[PDB]
Design a binder for this molecule. Structure first.
Ligand SMILES: CCCCCCCCCCCCCCCCCCCCCC(=O)SCCNC(=O)CCNC(=O)[C@H](O)C(C)(C)COP(=O)(O)OP(=O)(O)OC[C@H]1O[C@@H](n2cnc3c(N)ncnc32)[C@H](O)[C@@H]1OP(=O)(O)O
Ligand SMILES: CCCCCCCCCCCCCCCCCCCCCC(=O)SCCNC(=O)CCNC(=O)[C@H](O)C(C)(C)COP(=O)(O)OP(=O)(O)OC[C@H]1O[C@@H](n2cnc3c(N)ncnc32)[C@H](O)[C@@H]1OP(=O)(O)O
Ligand SMILES: Cc1cc2nc3c(=O)[nH]c(=O)nc-3n(C[C@H](O)[C@H](O)[C@H](O)COP(=O)(O)OP(=O)(O)OC[C@H]3O[C@@H](n4cnc5c(N)ncnc54)[C@H](O)[C@@H]3O)c2cc1C
Ligand SMILES: Cc1cc2nc3c(=O)[nH]c(=O)nc-3n(C[C@H](O)[C@H](O)[C@H](O)COP(=O)(O)OP(=O)(O)OC[C@H]3O[C@@H](n4cnc5c(N)ncnc54)[C@H](O)[C@@H]3O)c2cc1C
Lengths: 607, 609
């Protein structure tokens, strides 16, 4: 069929058998959505993804968008716009939208499971379809008058952008210099150049685009605290009827040539530089821009991590299908007999090692983002964890940089194994793995680099949090550890939990010691990404072991056939991950415990 | 990026002269007519040519890739890339290390691969196209007297060459190939089959002829690699006396692959005797010894591929470093709470220094590894610089090749991830060369034998079949460095742990092999651990060679180095110390993992994956 190989079975196993999300289906906010309907929804969008969405995956990469300087617009390849129309015609751009904007109320964990299929099949398609979701964010932060415009924007399916980055302001958002000048009538004129804006033009997919633009009001203070957020539409419109009016002064000037994700137009965006003003409306009519924009960034970060995990999953399943059919070499137990029967390559230990590595990380990462999503609804977190609203928000905030940072880094790294499994054929564009790699490289960069994820995780999600979310998660792991067929895995998990706790203590010591010895803080920076990755590995190992515990229960109860095979794979993956990935965390702890500032004191000229 | 290529002659000369003492042999015996000054001038010259005319078409070759005409069975290469090829030819760089009697300049292999590194960093496909004369020398070495005259012609005319092994069903398992050879009464052979993934099988109008060295199975020969013979199959027939090109021979490209990277290297389906015209082949050396003869070629290809990956990581790192030096973003971490603190260049950030020193230490440790390996590729160099005789040097070179290839390919691709990350969002742009470095280097874990095949060769052939003699030699050199100022005390302690870890890995895997005498399935544990073992030995060699470099750097600083020299030597100490403290300890956990491998993953139903 298509390049995209989906895994609804594993999503349903997580949602229902592991986390118990079906417990809230049929109750309260989700009163009208039952478990059967949720499963039909996943199967339906999986088929959409495997069909018309994936159909244009190759085309978007081989025949990428073209910038037109004669009109300051972008043209998209026809096959990809056909895929977009399939997404829209099915109403999938209203996934998880609030009911009053036309959505179907559902748990976030189900919402992200639906979205995984789009991100695996053609992830730029989800990015162009995020308009109604961003209109909901504008609604939540807007005045009563602005909530009327957001409703129009959602109902009409306008596109949307998030507009922060400038040539000199990427990780350091607060350095932005785009300016906002209030006009007598209460609107603002926005002036500046922004860079790397995803979907800044989208051909004729939509009748309008809502740009949500960070800019600094004249006279405002420095840094991110001096930023405000502005609603800046591509076209002016009638605030009552929605009728599209005159062009607004916000124009793309270039489209970047990228390693991958080529069909996502990534644009320099000029505001008020082409002779008409870029009129913006202060969101909520309050000056609170970085806090408002982080509502969007949080979702972008969830999407980026889920995208990376979706891509690893279809990479693994492509590699697995290939390995099952590729005949090459003799069985290793017959390697000295040059007339021995040839075997398929799944018989080779290094290939089974590779495949189980891909499998355990893909499925561990899926469990992680679905686990994370179970904290994004108060009702779900109460129902399935017994955790109240405040703690749930802090745990979600803790896990987001794991989904994003650990997800992006891990998926790209393990796709290397997926390609390797194809041999020389993995290097061909004939197979989709090399495009998976190119498309996923950006996931460690956009929505905040890995280093920024790791700094967020430690300084904000742990230290500022006074460790409360982290202690909750460590307690659940400890509970699992304390509890026969999983005794070895629980012992390996106990070592890994202790290692992560040791890392956290060492970095906390380096931070606290910076009050008297300022350079001590550098050791936190030196260790931060490795710590983030260690926590990701610990969470993967724990959730895999929890899956294997469920699988043991189901096999004991008499699972047969394809179910039995699935459950056997969960036990194998949990055991392989505990025995081959978790122990490296001990060496990483000892490395972190011995970090020093030699590398910081070295003259720059010595590099 | 046009001038994408950033060279490092200074580090090459440091290794060649200050660390390994390869100048000990320059001006003596086989190298009597090449002195150290000349060697350094050659490195400077090809590095300048690489940074200029060769690198000039690096982007062009990827963005305007070769185009196949299926009716002429030929490829057209972009003009800018052919201009780069002519610059290489006009300088004689396709004859680096060629025997004097073939028109070469005799030189140590360590110098030859250091020269080639610059071409591989600037435009690696250019060197692949230019390997013809080196092939001709291998053909010369393996040929009859008469073939030696043809090889001499081919080298003097600069013919291109290919190595033709792979078929759709015979990649890792070379012995499965079905291409056949049909003996003719006059002693020639007619070759019949379809080969796949053949690099340079057509090369536009770069050459007047191409020598295809083709593995094929004589009718009625036995199975496996042992049944294969090697055939000289020219693209054009030619006058065996004068070299004048004659009738087109029956060997035709029928497809050119669309690849992730290395796009300018035409990778070809090659049809032999399928178009009603015989593919005439001449039996190499007029003996049936094909897989042994072809491994002369494979050995050089594996060395090249490892050197290519390392060359590419080096320029990726130097590009990231020059970017990081200029990019202002954020406040110093000591001022992160003060939102009015001065902005700093990103080399001030701990994670960026960590990233950069990771790239540096791996790029420089890998350079030391391939140059160390090359010092064993001449008996006279191995004797002068290491005091080892010809037989042990060959076994040590053989031990190290899968490390250069397997560990070099895997490591370079992985650490280029850090190089790209250093550029931030800009690293994802084609405006910078790192994303093409990544795509171009992914192939290096695959062609010339996959990493799994490298690790299996390393363990079974280069350790077990060798009775551990080469490994024991290397380990003994590491042990002596550890035993020998206490300024490298911590590094030596860390290397001692890493050496014991690698020895423990080797003992575990050897134990699994011994157990396979009793339970055949125990051998699977060797396969499960083999790649991790090969990578561990690479880390150990990197950490050791960097520490040796640190010891020389300490001597030079003590003697009073100043200026740029001083900065260079300080960076060697920092790299060796960073690598010992951040890379080597992981080998302890890897050893423990290998000590506990089991066959659960082998017994699992394939359906459960
Ligand atoms: C259908 C479902 C319902 C509908 C809604 C859901 C749909 C969502 C739609 C969104 C889609 C997104 C994608 C859009 C389409 C195209 C795809 C594009 C993908 C990626 C695109 C991008 O790259 S956008 C640019 C991303 N840039 C970054 O992420 C910035 C990276 N740098 C940093 O994060 C730095 O660390 C910052 C900038 C934070 C450092 O500045 P600072 O030193 O001033 O920060 P601070 O002092 O630490 O805190 C300042 C201020 O900021 C708030 N804050 C910080 N960190 C926060 C986190 N992690 N979470 C929330 N808020 C955060 C905070 O208000 C703080 O104030 P205080 O609380 O400290 O007082
Ligand atoms: C000194 C520096 C100066 C150098 C100058 C440069 C000169 C080079 C010029 C090049 C000419 C132009 C060429 C242009 C090409 C440019 C691009 C190249 C890109 C890479 C292209 C490729 O990929 S070519 C295809 C590569 N294929 C492989 O590598 C094969 C992978 N599979 C394996 O290796 C398997 O492990 C094999 C096939 C070996 C398993 O078969 P088997 O089970 O039958 O093997 P065995 O029983 O273990 O051994 C059989 C036979 O083979 C000999 N042998 C095996 N392994 C050897 C090694 N490592 N080294 C030498 N010989 C080896 C051995 O003869 C054995 O017989 P026994 O000795 O055991 O009795
Ligand atoms: C495909 C793509 C799409 C994008 N889409 C959008 C979009 O829709 N909207 C938008 O607003 N932006 C968008 N961006 C911008 C993107 O978020 C930025 O590229 C990213 O935040 C990194 O910023 P930068 O590129 O300026 O890199 P830099 O900030 O210059 O980072 C360079 C290097 O320095 C490191 N570094 C920087 N500061 C620190 C620090 N304080 N501590 C430690 N290390 C540090 C980084 O980790 C990185 O390794 C997009 C980018 C890409 C590539
Ligand atoms: C760009 C490019 C250029 C090339 N140029 C040439 C050339 O000039 N000449 C030439 O002869 N060939 C050439 N090749 C072929 C190349 O050497 C083969 O692709 C390579 O040997 C792998 O073989 P394969 O692709 O058939 O993969 P397979 O052998 O099918 O390997 C598939 C997977 O199975 C694994 N596997 C296979 N056998 C075993 C085993 N026994 N034990 C454990 N794991 C195993 C592999 O490691 C890999 O992960 C080229 C290939 C490429 C991609």
């Amino acid at each position: 069929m298509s390049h995209y190989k989906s895994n609804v079975r594993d999503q349903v196993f997580n949602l229902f058998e592991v986390f118990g999300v079906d417990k809230v289906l049929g109750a309260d906010k989700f009163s009208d959505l039952d478990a059967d309907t949720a499963r039909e929804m996943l199967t339906e969008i999986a088929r959409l993804a495997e069909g018309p969405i994936a159909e244009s995956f190759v085309e978007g990469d081989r025949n990428p968008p073209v910038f037109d300087p004669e009109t300051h617009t972008v043209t998209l390849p026809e096959g990809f716009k056909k895929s977009m129309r399939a997404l829209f015609d099915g109403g999938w751009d209203k996934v998880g939208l609030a009911e009053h904007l036309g959505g179907i109320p559902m748990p976030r964990a189900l919402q992200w499971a639906l979205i995984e299929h789009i991100l695996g099949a053609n992830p730029a398609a989800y990015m162009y379809a995020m308009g109604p979701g961003m209109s909901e964010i504008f609604y939540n932060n807007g005045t009563d008058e602005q909530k009327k415009w957001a409703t129009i924007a959602a109902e009409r399916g306008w596109g949307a952008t998030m507009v922060l980055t400038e040539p000199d302001a990427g990780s350091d958002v607060g350095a932005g210099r785009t300016k906002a000048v209030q006009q007598p009538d209460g609107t603002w004129h926005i002036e500046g150049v922004k860079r790397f804006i995803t979907s800044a033009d989208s051909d004729d997919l939509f009748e309008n685009i809502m740009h949500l633009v960070l800019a600094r009001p004249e006279g405002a203070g420095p840094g991110t605290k001096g930023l405000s957020l502005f609603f800046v539409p591509k076209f002016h419109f009638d605030h009552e009827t929605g009728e599209i009016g005159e062009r607004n002064g916000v124009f793309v000037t270039n489209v970047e040539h990228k390693m991958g994700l080529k069909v996502s137009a990534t644009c320099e965006l000029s505001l008020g530089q082409h002779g008409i003003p870029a009129v913006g409306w202060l969101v909520g009519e309050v000056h609170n821009g970085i806090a408002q924009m982080f509502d969007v960034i949080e979702q972008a970060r969830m999407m980026v991590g889920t995208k990376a995990i979706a891509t690893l999953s279809t990479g693994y399943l492509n590699a697995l299908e290939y390995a099952k059919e590729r005949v090459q070499g003799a069985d290793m137990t017959q390697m000295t007999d040059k007339t021995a029967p040839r075997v398929t390559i799944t018989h080779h230990p290094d290939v089974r090692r590779s495949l189980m590595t891909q499998k355990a990380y893909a499925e561990g990462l899926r469990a992680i983002y679905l686990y994370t999503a179970t904290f994004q609804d108060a009702e779900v977190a109460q129902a399935v964890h017994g955790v109240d609203g405040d703690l749930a928000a802090r745990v979600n905030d803790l896990l987001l940089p794991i989904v994003k940072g650990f997800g992006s880094e891990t998926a790209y790294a393990k796709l290397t194994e997926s390609l390797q499994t194809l041999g020389g054929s993995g290097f061909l564009q004939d197979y989709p793995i090399e495009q998976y790699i190119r498309d996923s490289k950006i996931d460690s960069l956009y929505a905040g680099t890995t280093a920024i994820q790791a700094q967020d995780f430690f300084f904000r999600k742990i230290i500022r949090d006074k460790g409360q979310a982290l202690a909750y998660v460590a307690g659940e792991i400890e509970q699992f550890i304390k509890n026969g067929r999983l005794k070895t895995e629980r012992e390996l998990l106990a070592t890994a939990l202790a290692d992560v706790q040791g890392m956290a203590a060492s970095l906390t010591g380096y931070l606290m010691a910076a009050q008297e010895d300022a350079a001590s803080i550098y050791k936190v920076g030196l260790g931060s990404v490795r710590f983030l990755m260690a926590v990701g590995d610990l969470l993967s190992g724990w959730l895999l072991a929890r899956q294997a515990a469920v699988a043991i229960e189901k096999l004991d109860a008499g699972a047969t056939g394809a179910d039995k095979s699935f459950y056997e794979g969960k036990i194998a993956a949990a055991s392989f991950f505990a025995k081959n990935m978790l122990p490296l965390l001990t060496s990483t702890r000892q490395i972190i415990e011995n970090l020093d500032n030699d590398v910081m004191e070295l003259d720059e000229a010595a590099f």
